[PDB]
Amino acid sequence: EYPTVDDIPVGEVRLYKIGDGVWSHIATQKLGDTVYSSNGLIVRDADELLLIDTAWGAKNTVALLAEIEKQIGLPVTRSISTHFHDDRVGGVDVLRAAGVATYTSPLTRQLAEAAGNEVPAHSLKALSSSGDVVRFGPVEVFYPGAAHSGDNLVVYVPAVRVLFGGCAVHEASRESAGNVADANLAEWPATIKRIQQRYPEAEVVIPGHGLPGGLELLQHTTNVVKT
Numbered sequence: 001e002y003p004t005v006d007d008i009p010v011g012e013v014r015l016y017k018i019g020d021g022v023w024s025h026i027a028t029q030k031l032g033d034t035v036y037s038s039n040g041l042i043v044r045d046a047d048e049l050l051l052i053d054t055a056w057g058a059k060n061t062v063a064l065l066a067e068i069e070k071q072i073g074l075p076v077t078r079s080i081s082t083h084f085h086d087d088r089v090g091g092v093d094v095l096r097a098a099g100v101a102t103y104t105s106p107l108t109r110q111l112a113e114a115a116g117n118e119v120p121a122h123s124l125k126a127l128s129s130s131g132d133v134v135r136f137g138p139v140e141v142f143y144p145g146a147a148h149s150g151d152n153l154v155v156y157v158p159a160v161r162v163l164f165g166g167c168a169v170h171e172a173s174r175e176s177a178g179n180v181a182d183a184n185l186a187e188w189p190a191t192i193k194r195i196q197q198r199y200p201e202a203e204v205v206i207p208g209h210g211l212p213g214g215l216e217l218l219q220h221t222t223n224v225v226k227t
């Protein structure tokens, strides 16, 4: 049932229900002669939605908003981007045009500017140091330290124990680290250990790319990373 590249054309978006008031969104994108899929999250708060990450570019992000309106029918009023790459901030300008208040950490804003990428309009204070956690509506936003990138964040939904690990967590089937050009391989194991110690009751862990699993994806990541 979980959507894969085999069942999503570039430009279409699927939603997948994870728990009470929580969905993932799945989109596809072509870089080389390589098609990839990518995951974000949607979380209900009263009569509005918090979005976690864009759908990897402007075209997919317009389609994401249309699919949310078809299937859920509540407005997206705020978003958080979990690092500075195009699968997280690509389409922020679509979000802004639609009246969404877009956020991320100050470091993500700085790195996205340096990369030429779109930049969320607002900073999350108090996320500058490894181990820092803030509340944001129905979630917790945690900065566990450098890993896939220097600025990567994870997002936990306490009411239903769902952790979105983003691109700092690899899916079960992946055995290589992927794109490491912004990675800190030396800190990556310590970063995974902070996530494990902070969220020991998580029932679902969603990676930035691929199939959701449970807490076993965290040790799996450490294993892929060392090698």
Ligand SMILES: [Mg+2]
Pocket (backbone or CB within 6 Å): 086, 115, 116, 117
């Ligand atoms: Mg770019």
Ligand SMILES: [Zn+2]
Pocket (backbone or CB within 6 Å): 083, 085, 148, 149, 167
């Ligand atoms: Zn990335």
Ligand SMILES: [Zn+2]
Pocket (backbone or CB within 6 Å): 038, 085, 087, 167, 208, 209
């Ligand atoms: Zn990614």
